[PDB]
Design a protein around this ligand. Structure first.
Ligand SMILES: [Mg+2]
Ligand SMILES: [Zn+2]
Ligand SMILES: [Zn+2]
Lengths: 1347, 83, 99
RNA sequence: UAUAUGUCAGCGUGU
DNA sequence: ACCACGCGGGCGGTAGCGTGCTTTTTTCGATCTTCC
DNA sequence: GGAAGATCGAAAAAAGCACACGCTGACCCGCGTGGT
């Protein structure tokens, strides 16, 4: 019906056009008869009849009189629903300013009138005068005059100047001005001006003027003369007990406005004095402001409840506004809610629904079936029968729920799997029965959790539930591709107990014909479940053709394993069950079953596994007792030894040999060692406590202790918890993070005294408080991510782009967190991968890397692979399947129409709770040590050989890589400047050897040539001081910076020169400039004048001197500037220091051949890594510190900033052991990089300084190039998630997120038109979203619009 | 009965237009009074449509061809009645 | 709690909330995002229009279900109309373009 | 399905 | 002379809304420093 | 050599602060002022 939504400010004529009448009285209800009053807020003549097809007077009360207006009372005879649409208007006696265009920064009135907002407020609220027309006098036009100044001007000139006071003056000023003349004058002033602040103000005003001119808006329309009113049905008077009626804030505000307007009218008609009418006008303006926005200016008007009333703006914005409370989310019918219990008999696709819930939810279906089958003749009869709960009603209910899926959803819907479709099964009781295997997907436990159920109605919804949202379809996590259906607590324990062996059990050593005989023997009691026997196993394997071929053989196994083999499908081998089946073993067996056979056999196998595990866990009867937590007999001895050691340390400290800090460190180390020894002894005792007499000989076997069985099987518990149960609790930390000297040496089996419990309460409370406070931050971050990535869907198959990002394994000096296989798994390559050293292709250009391709890549020792990335997708208004990659939920490539952005946002947001928010809390090693054996490679290094033959680094950014024999870069290290090298490039090294040593305390100055040292331009007492040492007494020279040096020493630059025997400088090898080394401030020199030095000798020494998980993730995704950002070189060239001003250092970068327009003002306390005359490239660190993402994008490109962001986010998430694919982070990064600022206008019409969408620039450039014209140059800009979300083409999405007032004001001023492209806009409107099954339908619309 | 739709998904190949095709077939059975191409094992309309989609008897092209044939025969019948 | 069809709100014409008064569960923002993660286009449309706001849609859906036809008419949700009227009550004009 | 007449605060529960 | 609409609704005090959050934007006053 | 543009820092203002569910309390009223 409609294709787009247009928003603009309303003219008084159009406002009058909307209204069906004029409201002139504040009366609402007679309160004697409930008929509405005439000409009031509730009026039948203006808005509509109260009753359907009835007249207020009562002359006409039938459909036959439809559309004819009565003459006695003037009430049209239509449906009463017209009261929801018809509006009215109020004719203000005096003009009133609109608050949304008044106090919403930037102030539109102030910006357009170019005069301060406080002057606007003063003249508007009737406190001063402003001149509409200055005239031929000294008074300027836009001059603000107070009362006595106005009187002086009036007595000076009676009528030469015309000054008014109030909103009428503002309206006259807005109307008198000319938009085109002002715009051209502003443009010609901006062309000649040069001030940056003036340029910004002028361009902002130019943008506002152009927006006003292009649209049909008029400035005078920003001052209200006619006030629209809401339809009565949208502000109803809710009836209450008796004659009381519910109060509505909007009604009170409208009544106050009407009363003020009537009083002003009666004062104007009576020719009241100026003071009274001015006060009335001011109070009317305040009332209108309160109606539009209560708390925007001044104190909000309070009602009878001693609280501010809800204005029009208050009920549209915010979390409780119409956008977020009734449009994006809403209450639905055919829904219920109940607690959840566990149903062990249910299948993976089934759920248990109570009879009453199903009867209530499926009522219309029961009515229809009863009417069809003839048990009832009318709807009333069916209602009575279902109320009486007849026998046939139950049969009908069973019939209607045979294959009708129901959507089960938990209250926190963190990710996609929070709502799933299940087949209902009628059950008694009052609690919903949920399948255990899906609980991990729901993050639901049976401790009192509740779930909601929804009933799809149409055939399409049922088919989507069956095919898309069914439980069986959801088997892999979309976040990382890991399986989501794994046994957790009892299945694992049962399978572990069943698949175990005892060295001497009942019926051991016998031979069985097959698994059936084993089951018969176990059930008959003639054999034990752990008896080691030999059974005849027939296993089927898949050949090359896929046919199943059987192999029958005698296998040495246990009775339990043979019994479990019965439920294993035919295609699987016997090696999976011939072992103790823990959680990992069961997960691996399920993965193999899924990989070999398919989906349905995997589901059946999982159900059978759950049933068998539950049954045999029940049969085992495993229980936990006080005797199961065995305390080692050596714990007392270890504790006594530790106490003796700490007593000796305390005695040494009292003697004075060791100070407090090192004594505390040694005590902590001793207690940690004691705890480790106790834990090791307890684990050794527990793991093999059981000893069995086999043939009269004692034999050691794995213990059958229930606690140890639970720990080993992986059901519940871990090493730390078992250690706390049976060993000492270890050291504990104070709330500030400091470790307490005395640890908790008491087991949980034993008694913890009061002090130990009080100590542990600190950590317990800290953890609980962090968990409680994490939820709000996680939810806010998830909402921001969902918004910023709501409109991204797959709309194409292949861009054809040859660009992409290069993926390599991540290593930081000792560890390989993520090998290449996981990084490049399921991603389409961007270029042919050449075989290393042969220049032969290994994989084609556009092949998706599945498991076989990854195996081929890893077997050929490939380190770097360039793959297509979402951030490099050439598709506009969406991405492509090839550039995105394989879908993580389904192994195949992703399909068109999938909402990748929402999935990515949910996948990132969901593990937010697992992170940490509260901040937590030796010196850095001075040398680099190699942990493996391989070659050494040096990257970005300009080194020199010293006198001893060692190599010293003269480059700031130097990479030292340890490479294995296969060419894989196993280790990476960052070598600092002025670092000596034990071994050079290309030389093999042994494990544990040290290859680089350096001093981090101070930075030295290294000479690249050898010769005598000559001094240049230092004088004692001006630039250098020769200070004697405290003990040696040698006079070393210290250079003072600009703070200490005098004016005479300002231009004196200290320098050291390397000279030969002649006495002149030695020319630098490869550089015409001679060897000069300038000494910066606070530089200490030890060598004396004329001392011969070799290459690499240190001329002088310069002395040299976080956030948790969720805050760091939020800062990274918001592109927040760090407190002390690293200073980077904008352009490549030589460095030079200029004159110092403002307590700052001047930096000049001189390119080899280019111009020199770039200068920098480094803060004084910021350390300078670069020297006086070194060469630096683009994106080179001048001052150490955190790197601002904007600087990285500006100086290194999109790929570099994307890599930095994904690396930081992945590091933060991996610190907590969370696996998230990089596709989601890349999608978020691409969504952040959506705007670009022009540089050269070119043939395009874009303004030079304008910032516009990147897709629009790309389309315009493509169109211009297609015609042979020239394009436009652009620079991409980085925006935060909220900033990018607000700055989007669709104003509906921006207004529904946050800052609704500002977004709506800007859209109204600019006259923006929003086309309904995206998920949020279509959800708000109510049509099908352009994603998923509806996506194709939307394409049809795109086909119809073109035709 | 039906527990998974993987074979139907691979028969269609997208899993998004499969829902649309199954919905069209189910509407044809339930509203148009058509007859299933598979034995009716008391299953629901959607399950029957998916089951008959699984063995390749129903797809978008087949449904379009049958609709075109029905339209042409109805047009021929009404033209003969008019004449 | 369980409700097929019951009383509706006045201003928004949406199902009431709570168990003391017959009301429906709230399909919040997170559930909408989860549905958008799937295909779930028709399910979302029926949750937003047929089941909550579209009064004509509600009547037609109930009649169709009673008549044995599982087909829905999307229609126009009343919440959007209420929001449009609320914005129009200010000095801002917002309208739907048929072009 | 349209039924009898629901809006704001404060407090609490589970993730 | 008593009384029912009415209306706005803030406590406290020569007014101003503050005392234990974080981030972003704008504004102005003071200081510098650039240059013709 | 002093006016104007650039810079620094303090201050003021605005906007944000997860989801779902349950319960209870209020939905008058008091001066005041002209109408009678
Ligand atoms: Mg729980
Ligand atoms: Zn009448
Ligand atoms: Zn692409």
């Amino acid at each position: 019906e409609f294709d787009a939504i247009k928003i603009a400010l309303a003219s008084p004529d159009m406002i009058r056009s909307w209204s069906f009448g004029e409201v002139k009285k504040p009366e609402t209800i007679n309160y004697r008869t409930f008929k509405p009053e005439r000409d009031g807020l509730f009026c039948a003549r203006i808005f509509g009849p109260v009753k359907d097809y009835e007249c207020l007077c009562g002359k006409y009360k039938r459909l036959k009189h439809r559309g004819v207006i009565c003459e006695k009372c003037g009430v049209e005879v239509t449906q009463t629903k017209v009261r929801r649409e018809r509006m009215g208007h109020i004719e203000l006696a005096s003009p009133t300013a609109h608050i949304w265009f008044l106090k919403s920064l930037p102030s539109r009135i102030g910006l357009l009138l170019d005069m301060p907002l406080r002057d606007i407020e003063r003249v508007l609220y009737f406190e001063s005068y402003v001149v509409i027309e200055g005239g031929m006098t000294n008074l300027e036009r836009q001059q603000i005059l107070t009362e006595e100044q106005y009187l002086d001007a009036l007595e000076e000139f009676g009528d030469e100047f015309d000054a008014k006071m109030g909103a009428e003056a503002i309206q006259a000023l807005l109307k008198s001005m000319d938009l085109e003349q002002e715009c051209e004058q502003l443009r010609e002033e901006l062309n000649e001006t040069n001030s940056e602040t003036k340029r910004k103000k002028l361009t902002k005003r130019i943008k506002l003027l152009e927006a006003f001119v292009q649209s049909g808006n008029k400035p005078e329309w920003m001052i209200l003369t006619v006030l629209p009113v809401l339809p009565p049905d949208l502000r109803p008077l809710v009836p209450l007990d008796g004659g009381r009626f519910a109060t509505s804030d909007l009604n009170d505000l409208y009544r106050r406005v009407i009363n003020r307007n009537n009083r002003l009218k009666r004062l104007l008609d009576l020719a009241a004095p100026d003071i009274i009418v001015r006060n009335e006008k001011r109070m009317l303006q305040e009332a209108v402001d309160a109606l539009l926005d209560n708390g925007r200016r001044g104190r909000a008007i309070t009602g009878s409840n001693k609280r501010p009333l809800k204005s029009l703006a208050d009920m549209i914005k915010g979390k409780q506004g119409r956008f977020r409370q009734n449009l994006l989310g809403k209450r639905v019918d055919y829904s219920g809610r109940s607690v959840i219990t566990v149903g062990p008999y249910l299948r993976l696709h089934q759920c248990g629904l109570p009879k009453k819930m199903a009867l209530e939810l499926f009522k219309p279906f029961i009515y229809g079936k009863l009417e069809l089958r003839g048990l009832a003749t009318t709807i009333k009869a069916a209602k009575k029968m279902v109320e009486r709960e007849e026998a046939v009603v139950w049969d009908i209910l069973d019939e209607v729920i045979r294959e009708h899926p129901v959507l089960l959803n938990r209250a926190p819907t963190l990710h996609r799997l929070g709502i799933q479709a299940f087949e209902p099964v009628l059950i008694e009781g009052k609690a919903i029965q949920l399948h255990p295997l899906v609980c991990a997907a729901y993050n639901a436990d049976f401790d009192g959790d509740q779930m909601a159920v929804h009933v799809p109605l149409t055939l399409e919804a049922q088919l989507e539930a069956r095919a898309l949202m069914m439980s069986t379809n959801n088997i892999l996590s979309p976040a990382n591709g890991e399986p989501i259906i794994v046994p957790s607590q009892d299945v694992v324990l049962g399978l572990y107990y069943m698949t175990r062996d005892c060295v001497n059990a009942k019926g051991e050593g016998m031979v069985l014909t097959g698994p059936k005989e084993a089951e018969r023997l176990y059930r008959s009691g003639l054999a034990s479940l752990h008896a080691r026997v030999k059974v005849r196993i027939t296993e089927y394997e898949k050949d090359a053709n896929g046919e199943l071929v059987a192999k029958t053989s005698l296998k040495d196994t246990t009775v339990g394993r043979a019994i479990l083999w019965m439920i294993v499908p035919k295609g699987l081998p016997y090696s999976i069950v011939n072992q103790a089946l823990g959680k990992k073993a069961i997960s691996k067996m399920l993965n193999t079953c899924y990989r070999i056979l398919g989906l349905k056999p995997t589901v059946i196998f999982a159900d059978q596994i759950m049933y068998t595990g539950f049954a045999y866990a029940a049969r085992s009867g495993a229980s936990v007792g006080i005797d199961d937590m065995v305390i080692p007999e050596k714990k007392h001895e270890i504790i006594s030894e530790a106490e003796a050691e700490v007593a000796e340390i305390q005695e040494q400290f009292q003697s004075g040999l060791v100070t407090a800090g090192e004594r505390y460190n040694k005590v902590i180390d001793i207690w940690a060692a004691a705890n480790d020894r106790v834990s090791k002894a307890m684990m050794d005792n527990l793991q093999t406590e059981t000893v069995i007499n086999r043939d009269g000989q004692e034999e050691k076997q794995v213990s059958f202790n229930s606690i140890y069985m639970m720990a080993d099987s992986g059901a519940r518990g871990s090493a730390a918890q078992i250690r706390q149960l049976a060993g000492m609790r270890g050291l504990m930390a104070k709330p500030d993070g400091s470790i307490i000297e005395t640890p908790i040496t008491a087991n949980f089996r034993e008694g913890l005294n009061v002090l130990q419990y009080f100590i542990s309460t600190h950590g317990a409370r800290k953890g609980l408080a962090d968990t409680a406070l994490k939820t709000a931050n996680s939810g806010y971050l998830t909402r921001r991510l969902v918004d910023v990535a709501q409109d991204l869907v797959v709309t194409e198959d292949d861009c054809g782009t040859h660009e992409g990002i290069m993926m390599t394994p991540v290593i930081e000096g000792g560890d390989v967190k993520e090998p290449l296989r996981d990084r490049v798994l399921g991603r389409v390559t961007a270029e042919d991968v050449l075989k290393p050293g042969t220049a032969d292709i290994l994989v084609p250009r556009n092949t998706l890397l599945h498991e076989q391709w990854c195996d081929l890549l890893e077997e050929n020792s490939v380190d770097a692979v360039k793959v297509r990335s979402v951030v490099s997708c050439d598709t506009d208004f969406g991405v492509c399947a090839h550039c995105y990659g394989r879908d993580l939920a389904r192994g195949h490539i992703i399909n068109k129409g999938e909402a990748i952005g929402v999935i990515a946002a949910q996948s990132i947001g969901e593990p937010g709770t697992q992170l940490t928010m509260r901040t937590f809390h030796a010196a850095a090693e001075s040398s680099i040590q190699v942990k493996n054996k391989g070659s050494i490679k040096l990257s970005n290094v300009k080194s020199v050989v010293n006198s001893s033959g060692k190599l010293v680094i003269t480059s700031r950014n130097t990479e030292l890589k340890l490479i294995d024999e296969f060419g894989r870069t196993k280790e990476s290290y960052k070598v600092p400047y002025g670092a000596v090298l034990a071994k050079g490039d290309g030389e093999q090294v042994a494990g544990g050897e040290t290859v680089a040593n350096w001093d981090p305390h101070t930075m030295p100055v290294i000479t690249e040539v050898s010769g005598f040292v000559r001094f240049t331009d230092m004088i004692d007492g001006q630039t250098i001081t020769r200070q004697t040492d405290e003990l040696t007494g040698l006079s070393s020279l210290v250079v003072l910076d600009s703070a200490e040096r005098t004016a005479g020493g300002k231009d004196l630059r200290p320098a050291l020169k390397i000279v030969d025997a002649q006495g002149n400088d030695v020319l630098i090898p490869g550089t015409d400039m001679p060897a000069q080394y300038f000494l910066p401030g606070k530089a200490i020199v030890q060598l004396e004048d004329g001392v011969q030095i070799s290459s690499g000798d240190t001329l002088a020494r310069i002395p040299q001197e976080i956030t948790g998980g969720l805050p760091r993730v939020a800062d990274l995704f918001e592109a927040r500037r760090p407190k002390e950002p690293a200073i980077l070189a904008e352009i490549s060239g030589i460095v030079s220091f200029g004159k110092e001003t403002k307590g700052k250092r001047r930096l000049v970068i001189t390119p080899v051949d280019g111009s020199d327009p770039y200068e920098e003002m480094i803060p004084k306390w910021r350390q300078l890594n670069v020297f006086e005359g070194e060469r630096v490239e683009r994106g080179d660190v001048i001052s150490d510190g955190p790197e601002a993402p904007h600087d990285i994008l500006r100086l290194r490109g999109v790929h570099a900033v994307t890599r930095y962001i994904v690396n930081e986010v992945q590091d933060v998430y991996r610190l907590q052991g969370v696996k998230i694919n990089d596709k989601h982070i890349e999608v978020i990064v691409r969504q952040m990089l959506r705007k670009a600022t022009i540089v050269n206008a070119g043939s395009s019409d874009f303004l030079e300084g304008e910032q516009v969408e990147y897709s629009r620039v790309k389309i315009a450039n493509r169109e211009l190039e297609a015609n042979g014209k020239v394009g436009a140059t652009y620079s991409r800009d980085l925006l935060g998630i909220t900033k990018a979300s607000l700055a989007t083409e669709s104003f509906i999405s921006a207004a529904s997120f946050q800052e609704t007032t500002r977004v709506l004001t800007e859209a109204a001023v600019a006259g923006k038109r929003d086309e309904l492209r995206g998920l949020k806009e279509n959800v708000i409107v109510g049509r099908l979203i352009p994603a998923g099954t509806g996506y194709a339908y939307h394409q049809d619309r795109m086909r119809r619009r073109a035709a | 009965a039906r527990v998974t739709v993987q074979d139907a998904v691979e028969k269609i190949g997208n899993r998004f237009d499969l829902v649309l095709v199954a919905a069209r077939r189910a509407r044809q059975m339930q509203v148009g009074g058509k007859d299933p191409l598979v034995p009716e094992e008391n299953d629901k309309t959607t399950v029957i449509a998916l089951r008959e989609i699984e063995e390749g008897l129903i797809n978008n092209q087949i449904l379009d061809v049958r609709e075109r044939q029905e339209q042409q025969e109805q047009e021929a019948a009404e033209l003969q009645a008019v004449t | 709690h369980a409700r097929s069809t019951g009383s509706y709100s006045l201003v928004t014409q949406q199902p009431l909330g709570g168990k003391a008064q017959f009301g429906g569960q709230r399909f919040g923002e997170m559930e909408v995002w989860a549905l958008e993660a799937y295909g779930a286009a028709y399910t979302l449309q029926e949750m937003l229009t047929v089941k909550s706001d579209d009064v004509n849609g509600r009547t037609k859906m109930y009649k169709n279900i009673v008549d044995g036809n599982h087909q829905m008419e999307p229609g126009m949700p009343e919440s959007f109309n209420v929001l449009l009227k609320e914005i129009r009550s200010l000095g801002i004009n917002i309208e739907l373009e048929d072009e």
